[PDB]
Amino acid sequence: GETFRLGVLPFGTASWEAAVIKARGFDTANGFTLDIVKLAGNDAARIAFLGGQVDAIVGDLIFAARLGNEGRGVRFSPYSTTEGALMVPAGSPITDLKGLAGKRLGVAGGALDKNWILLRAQARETAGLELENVAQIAYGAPPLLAQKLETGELDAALLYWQFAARLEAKGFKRLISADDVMRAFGAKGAVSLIGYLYEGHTVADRGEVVRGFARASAAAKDALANEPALWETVRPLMAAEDDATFATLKRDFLAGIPRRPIAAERADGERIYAALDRLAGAQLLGVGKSLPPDLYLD
């Protein structure tokens, strides 16, 4: 038949809808078999993608644009409009981004992470502040940062959205999302920065498997939005034995299901991208002059 290899992170949310696709036979319904490939982290996943070891991974539009500008035929399809969480201790003095000055701030994904680019752009626009000049920045994978924020070695951490529900149950508050930043910028609607990244070669030679997987994913998300009972089936993959954590993860996932046409998604991405590569012409590191051509999957 046709096998589609999806690379997934152990702390990621893509494994949730992948389990729905398999359980409900939404891959079979689309003429393919989904093979979930477990990758240990984003660095390994990006290499697996560069090495052609998977047909797709989940990633961000800014990384996708960078691979496209670097010559790759990668295509992007919206995965979620829920992205990023700046977590501070409950009761923290920190009410604004200026309060990060002097703080040990964890930043998931490194200096070029999309959530960090957004947050740095916001701090420059609203306070004329370069967070890298005032905060003690510690980059790292989200699990490590969340643990060290819990242990008190970090004063704050910019993490993936799922880590909010988890930390709220342990004494932490989400001060700001990447979605909050893009609304402050003025985006027309919910912007999907997180998407499926499809291998150019798979798009060219197995385009119907790509479309079959895209349909299977949309059907899985639709099932989770329409069938509350299905969430209890996928709970083991969510690391959510705590009830408030399980409920918050569901709420934030549902709020992020993409529900706008690709044309509108593309135009918002184009404008937010063009607004990032600015901030007093700071040519923010990680951001190219413009999006590479034909990045979005039709």
Task: From 200, 220, 219, select the one nearest 210 (Cα to Cα).
Answer: 200
CA gap 92, 154 in Å, rounded = 13
For 115, the token pair is 């959530």
For 275, the token pair is 């607004």
Edge-to-edge strand ranges of the sheet holding 136-140: 136-140, 104-108, 156-159, 85-89, 172-176
Task: From 253, 252, 42, 63, select the one nearest 139 (Cα to Cα).
Answer: 42
Provide the minimum distance between the beta carbon of 93 and Na ion in the complex, in angstroms, as a whole number: 45
Is 72 a binding residue for Na ion by CB under 5 A? The answer is: yes
Is 209 a binding residue for Na ion by CB under 5 A? The answer is: no
CA gap 268, 81 in Å, rounded = 12
The only residue of 41, 143, 200, 288 in contact with Na ion, by rule CB under 5 A: 200
For 264, the token pair is 């509108």
Provide the minimum distance between the beta carbon of 9 and ligand PQQ in the complex, in angstroms, as a whole number: 4
Q: Is 84 annotated as a binding residue?
A: yes
Which is nearer to ligand PQQ, 21 or 128 (by Cβ)? 21
Q: Is 42 annotated as a binding residue?
A: no
Cα atoms found within 13 Å of the Cα of residue 200, Cβ hemisphere only: 11
Is 65 a binding residue for Na ion by CB under 5 A? The answer is: no
Which is nearer to Na ion, 113 or 199 (by Cβ)? 199
Stretch 140-199 residues interacting with Na ion (CB under 5 A) = 199
Provide the minimum distance between the beta carbon of 281 and ligand PQQ in the complex, in angstroms, as a whole number: 26
Which is nearer to Na ion, 73 or 89 (by Cβ)? 73
- Point out the annotated binding site for pyrroloquinoline quinone: 9, 13-14, 84, 114-115, 160-162
- Point out the annotated binding site: 9, 13-14, 84, 114-115, 160-162
Q: What is the contact surface with Na ion in residues (CB under 5 A)? A: 72-74, 199-200, 215, 219
